[PDB]
């Protein structure tokens, strides 16, 4: 559960960074839950680029940034309730924060962003996900 | 069937902020996704494609202001029927992960979008926060999607609708309102040029 949520975050970040020159750490490439989330998040970075830019403008990411600032930005994302679309935007925002810090030559911030996402997922989103059909219900709609 | 048959109003109200709507001067060549006829105050568009609508304002509304969109049928004998998606499109797989499947009007490109199913009127609406124009611009642009054709049998069934745009505050009180006719077709440019004659 807590480990299970940690894994889906790190696999999401591993793929995004690997799709650029950055390497970071049976039938896992085709795993259906993660595969459709990656395809959904790739769509989201294009359509909501304005929003993600604003969110990372608010999240003035530096080595000194604490969890609380990250939590503040993503909490605004769910203020009106949780849905699959907003959860996808939660994953893709973390991905763009990770690519941004690698591009700004602050690669060790990737570990912090990854731990924050897993923390926020376990603390605030996991109960909603289990109550609304689990990840299987997400793939049933493909979003 | 509207809750209590209490049709929402469509009267223009520019209000204290000089609220008006603007539209792109796109032509009528049949490769047009979206174009607005000023003579008919009617927008013609294709399903699930972008319809830019601009919000013009002479004095900036305060933060916390919101922009709501709602559809109603134009002919008076149908104004009491709630505008919904056809059953076929409501069941098809086109969820954006934000809009409930039954809503006809969507906003794309806005993470802060909100969809309402009214507990009294049973009418659908979509809400986003108002934001001042960007630098270089003089208006705020919203990108709308209509998720049924006007011809969809079992939904609109060739009945013309109107979209009603309202400026509200945090409490939902009225700050302004504008409206325009909508035809979601297959060939928007040919249909505008056809109707813009006879
Ligand atoms: Zn339809």
Cα distances from A50 to residues A47, A56, B111, B112, in angstroms, run 8, 10, 9, 12
Using CA atoms of B113, B45, B164, B60 in order, give the dihedral in degrees to the nearest 10.
60
What is the distance in A from the centroid of ligand 1 to the CA of B89?
5
| Cα B176 to averaged position of ligand 1 atoms, centre (Å) | 30
CA distances from B149 to A46, B13, B19, B23, B74 (A): 26, 29, 29, 21, 15
Largest CA distance in chain A: 40
Contact yes or no for B35/B108 (Cβ under 8 A)? no
SS3 B155: coil
* CA pseudo-torsion sign B87, B53, B61, A50: positive
- Which tokens is A3 given? 């480990």
Q: Residues A59, A61, A62, A68: what is their CA dihedral angle, to the nearest 10 degrees?
A: 50
**Structure-token match 């940690």, residue found:** A6
DSSP B25-58: ----STT-SEEEETTTTEEEEETTS-EEEEEE-S
Residue matched to tokens 């208006």? B139
Q: What string of DSSP letters covers B71-115?
A: EEESSGGGTTS-----HHHHHSS---SSS-TT-SEEE-S-TT-EE
Checking chain A for breaks where C and the next N are over 2.5 Å apart, the residues before them are 25
C-alpha distances (whole Å) from A32 to each of A15, A93, A128 are 15, 21, 20
Triad B57, B58, B59: Cα angle to 5°: 95
Which residue ranges of B make up the annotated binding site? Answer: 86, 89, 148, 152
Tokens of A127: 């109960």
CA distance B19 to B116: 23
Token pair listed for B130? 């108002």
- The 3-state DSSP composition of chain B as helix, strand, coil percent (nearest 5) reads 10, 35, 55
Task: List chain A residues with CB under 8 Å of B98.
Answer: 83, 85-86
Q: How far is CA B149 from the centre of its chain?
A: 14
What torsion do the CA atoms of A105, A108, A110, A111 make, to the nearest 10 degrees? Answer: 180
Q: Which phi and psi angles does A108 have, rounded to 5°? A: -70, -10
State which residue of chain B sits closest to A54, comparing Cα positions.
B111
| Residue in A8, A44, A1 with CA at minimum distance from that of residue A117 | A8
CB contact (8 A) between residue A85 and residue B97: yes
Cα separation, A107 vs B67, whole angstroms: 40
> B34 Cβ partners below 8 Å, 6+ apart?
B24, B26, B43, B44, B45, B46, B49, B50, B51, B52, B188
For residues A74 and A57, give the distance between their C-alpha atoms in angstroms, rounded to a whole number. 13
User: How many pairs of residues across A and B have Cβ atoms under 8 Å apart?
Assistant: 35
Q: Which residue shows structure tokens 């989330």?
A: A37
Residue B142 contacts residue B148 (beta carbons within 8 Å): no
Minimal CA separation from A86 to chain B, in Å: 7
> Is-contact A52 A41, C-beta < 8 A?
no
Using CA atoms in the order B63, A70, B96, B133, what is the torsion angle rounded to 10 degrees? 30
Phi and psi for A117 in degrees, rounded to 5? -60, -45
| Element counts in chain B: helices (H) and strands (E) | 2, 11
User: Two tokens at B106?
Assistant: 């969507």
Approach to solving: X-ray
Residues of A (67-96) whose Cβ lies below 8 Å from B: 77, 80, 83-89
* DSSP at B134: P
Asked if B96's CB is within 8 angstroms of A48's CB, the reply is no
Domain range annotation of chain B: 1-198
Q: How far apart are CA B39 and CA B109, in angstroms?
A: 29
- The number of angstroms, rounded, from the C-alpha of A86 to the middle of its chain's C-alpha atoms is 10
Q: Nearest CA to A11 among A121, A120, A95, A123?
A: A95
Q: What is the CA radius of gyration of chain B?
A: 16
Spatial contact of B147 and B48, defined as CB atoms under 8 Å apart: yes
Q: For residue A87, what are its two tokens?
A: 């959860």
Tokens (6 digits) for A90: 């939660």
Contacts of B170 (CB under 8 A, 6+ apart): B64, B65, B66
- How far is residue B14's CA from residue A40's CA, in Å, rounded to a whole number? 40
SS3 A113: helix
Burial letters for B12-44: b for 16+ Cβ neighbours within 10 Å, e otherwise? eeeeebebebbbeebebeeebebbbbeeeebbb
Return the structure tokens found at B26. Answer: 């796109």
Resolution (A): 2.4
């Amino acid at each position: 559960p807590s480990q299970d949520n940690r894994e889906i975050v790190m696999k999401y970040i591993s793929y995004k960074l690997s799709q650029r020159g950055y390497e970071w750490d049976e039938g896992t490439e085709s795993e259906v839950v993660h595969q459709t989330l990656r395809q959904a998040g790739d769509d989201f970075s294009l359509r909501y680029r304005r929003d993600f830019a604003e969110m990372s403008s608010q999240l003035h990411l530096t080595p000194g940034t604490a969890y609380a600032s990250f939590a503040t930005v993503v909490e605004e994302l769910f203020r009106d309730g949780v849905n699959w679309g907003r959860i996808v935007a939660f994953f893709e925002f973390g991905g763009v924060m990770c690519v941004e810090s690698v591009n700004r030559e602050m690669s060790v911030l990737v570990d912090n962003i990854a731990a924050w996402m897993a923390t926020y997922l376990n603390d605030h989103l996991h109960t909603w996900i289990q109550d609304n059909g689990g990840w299987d219900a997400f793939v049933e709609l493909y979003g | 069937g509207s809750g209590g048959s209490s049709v929402p109003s469509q009267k223009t109200y520019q209000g204290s902020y000089g609220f008006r709507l603007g539209f792109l001067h796109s032509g009528t060549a049949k490769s047009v996704t979206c174009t607005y006829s000023p003579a008919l105050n009617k927008m013609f568009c294709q399903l699930a494609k972008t319809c830019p609508v601009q919000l013009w304002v002479d004095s900036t509304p305060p933060p916390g202001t919101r922009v709501r969109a709602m559809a109603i049928y134009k002919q008076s004998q149908h104004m009491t029927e709630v505008v919904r998606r056809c059953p076929h499109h409501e069941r098809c797989s086109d969820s954006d992960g934000l809009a409930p499947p039954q809503h006809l009007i969507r906003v794309e490109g806005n993470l802060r979008v909100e969809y309402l199913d009214d507990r009294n009127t049973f009418r659908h609406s979509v809400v986003v926060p108002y934001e001042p124009p960007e630098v270089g611009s003089d208006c705020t642009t919203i990108h709308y999607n209509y998720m049924c054709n006007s011809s969809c049998m079992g939904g609109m069934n060739r009945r013309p609708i109107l979209t009603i745009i309202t400026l509200e505050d945090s409490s939902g009180n009225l700050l302004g309102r504008n409206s325009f006719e909508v035809r979601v077709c297959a060939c928007p440019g040919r249909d505008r040029r056809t109707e813009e004659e006879n």
